[PDB]
């Protein structure tokens, strides 16, 4: 059992809303993996001074090769020195089209499946809304321009419109009645049954959550889910550079630039696999076009304003449209919110005047205003919404430079032992 | 509400304005100051370009209870200082109220570019409210 120093530095960059891999390391069953990443994160030069900080999220997952390669892997390992070589997957014939999984597309335009499948699995088990279509892309070449290079899009920071109730949420439960009578005992079960359905719809869409519900547990191997080993996050701040020449004097450019550590406590790697670490930069969804729900309603009813408890706990959800939340709110986008939820949270305010001011990372256009009457598309972060405020994405929206200190104890003959025959 | 103190290179001490300085002005005799009626004076009496149609009723010898800010005329036409380079209410007419209320245009002069109006601010409003409120779960759950 000896130390293998896999420390290495990395220079990266990506688009706002998209989730990018920043460092992946292959591990072996028996490995004791430790990772201390430290460095600084920045964003392409801004147009004006600094407005608000971006929330940066770093993740480190562990994925058994078995999760990727399936039973085909168990054999690979079982057959040992005979095993049918594991198949690789395909990327498009472009260098960058492998980015989402932290690597340049190799000479042969094909990268190892575990990189690709892991990225998916990670995305489907933690980043997409449980109700959104599960990402299934077979190969890195079924991926489109933006995705393959920048990573999949993730959800905006949770707020009233970005974190609604799953669209298929029941708004009424019908129960069969005879013609002149009703089974009150049936009506009973009816409700109970509804309950089980809601419990699920609301927060138990994933198998594990259902089991946990009974007060049980589930190995990560049960539903084949990446293992979240470590998750840190922080706010990216910086400074303004002052203009000093005849015409620039009195102008300011914001240079976001935050240092940070992302430490992963010693971890025991039970089976051969990959340790993937990804980042995700986002800006809180501030919009000069959003207003308090109550300022929007035209006919203010008791059931709205009053905030009568008796009601708030027994009414069904409420279907409202983005129109109800933004002046330019797309009306075709319907979201189901919880009653009087506008009394459980206050929205951020931006004087309209910032509306057309190039340079602030605000949503100067009602969310999903150019994706169509599609909710999911509105909820996921459209990185173009930001092209506006950057002086020049020569390094995309953001970028970072960090040193990844990695120490791994493992059964490994010494290089000498490898090169020496006798 | 943001405001700039009404400094003007065009204002002068009331007493420097009066033409015929009387005992009742200068002397500051108590016996008088406490028994005379208010005094009607016009902005002309306070500014060189003071609009004379603007009449204000002040308290006697009030010019002895307060000293006015001074700005060397030279700053008169210097673009950049938040002073009232024009006697208050000089472009609203012989209307007192209009002179008294703050005309924000009086300031357009000193700003390089109101891309964000005269002023602007960015703050975080931390608000905590205790209230009778069922939990979101209780709202979305029927049974």
């Amino acid at each position: 059992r000896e130390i293998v120093d896999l420390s290495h530095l990395a220079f990266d960059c990506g688009m706002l809303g998209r989730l990018k891999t920043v460092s992946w390391t292959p591990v072996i069953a028996g490995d004791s993996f430790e990772l201390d990443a430290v460095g600084a994160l920045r964003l392409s030069p801004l147009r004006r001074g600094l407005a608000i900080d971006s929330k940066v999220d770093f993740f480190t997952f562990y994925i058994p090769h078995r999760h990727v390669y399936g039973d085909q892997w168990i054999q690979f390992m079982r057959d040992g020195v005979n095993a049918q070589p594991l198949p690789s997957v395909t990327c498009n014939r472009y260098p960058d089209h492998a980015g989402y999984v932290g690597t340049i597309v190799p000479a042969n335009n094909r990268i190892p499946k575990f990189l690709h499948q892991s990225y998916l699995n990670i995305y489907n088990n933690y980043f997409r809304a449980p109700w959104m279509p599960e990402r299934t892309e077979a190969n890195p070449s079924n991926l489109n321009e933006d995705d393959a290079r920048y990573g999949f899009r993730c959800c905006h920071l949770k707020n009233i419109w970005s974190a609604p109730l799953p669209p298929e949420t029941k708004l009424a439960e019908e129960m069969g009645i005879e013609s002149n009578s009703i089974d009150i005992m049936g009506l009973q079960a009816a409700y109970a049954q509804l309950h089980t359905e809601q419990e699920r719809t609301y927060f138990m869409q994933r198998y594990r959550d259902v089991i946990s519900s009974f007060g049980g547990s589930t190995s990560y191997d049960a539903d084949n889910r990446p293992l979240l080993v470590m998750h840190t996050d922080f706010w990216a701040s910086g400074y303004d550079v002052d203009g000093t020449d005849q015409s620039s004097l009195g102008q300011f450019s914001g240079r976001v630039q935050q240092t940070f550590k992302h430490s992963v406590p010693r971890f025991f790697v039970p089976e051969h696999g990959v340790m993937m670490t990804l980042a995700l930069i986002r800006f809180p969804p501030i919009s000069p076009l959003e207003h308090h729900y109550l300022a929007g309603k035209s006919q203010l009813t008791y059931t709205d304003l009053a905030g009568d408890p008796a009601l708030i706990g027994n009414l069904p959800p409420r279907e409202i449209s983005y129109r109800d939340l933004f002046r330019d709110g797309r009306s075709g986008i319907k979201i189901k919110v919880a009653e009087s939820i506008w009394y459980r949270t206050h929205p951020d305010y931006v004087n309209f005047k910032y509306h057309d001011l190039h340079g602030f990372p605000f949503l100067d256009d009602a969310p999903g205003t150019s994706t169509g009457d599609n909710l999911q598309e509105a909820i996921l972060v459209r990185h173009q919404d930001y092209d506006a405020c950057f002086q020049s994405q020569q390094l995309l929206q953001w970028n970072k430079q960090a040193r990844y200190n990695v120490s791994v104890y493992r059964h490994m003959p010494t290089v000498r032992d490898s090169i020496m025959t006798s | 509400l943001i405001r700039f103190p009404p400094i003007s290179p065009l204002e002068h001490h009331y007493l420097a304005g009066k033409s015929q300085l009387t005992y009742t002005d200068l002397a500051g005799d108590p016996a008088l100051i406490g028994n005379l009626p208010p005094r009607e004076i016009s902005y002309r009496d306070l500014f060189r370009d003071g609009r004379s149609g603007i009449k204000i009723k002040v308290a006697e010898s009030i010019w002895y209870r307060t000293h006015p800010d001074y700005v060397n005329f030279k700053y008169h036409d210097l673009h950049g200082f938040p002073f009232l380079d024009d006697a208050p209410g000089t472009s609203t007419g012989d209307n007192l109220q209009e002179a008294i209320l703050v005309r924000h245009q009086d300031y357009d002069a000193c700003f390089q570019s109101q891309q964000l109006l005269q002023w602007n601010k960015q703050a975080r409003y931390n608000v905590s409210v205790y209230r009778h409120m069922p939990t979101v779960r209780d709202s979305i759950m029927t049974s």
């Binding site: 949770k158 974190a163 927060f203 138990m204 994933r206 | 960015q122």
Partner: peptide
């Protein structure tokens, strides 16, 4: 009146749960 030199604003961030969406979403 506060001395400090202007800082950019961070997170809009508490009581019980608000966002039910079917499971965990980052």
């Amino acid at each position: 009146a506060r001395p400090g030199r202007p800082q950019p604003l961070r997170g809009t961030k508490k009581g019980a749960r608000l966002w039910y969406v079917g499971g965990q979403q980052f």
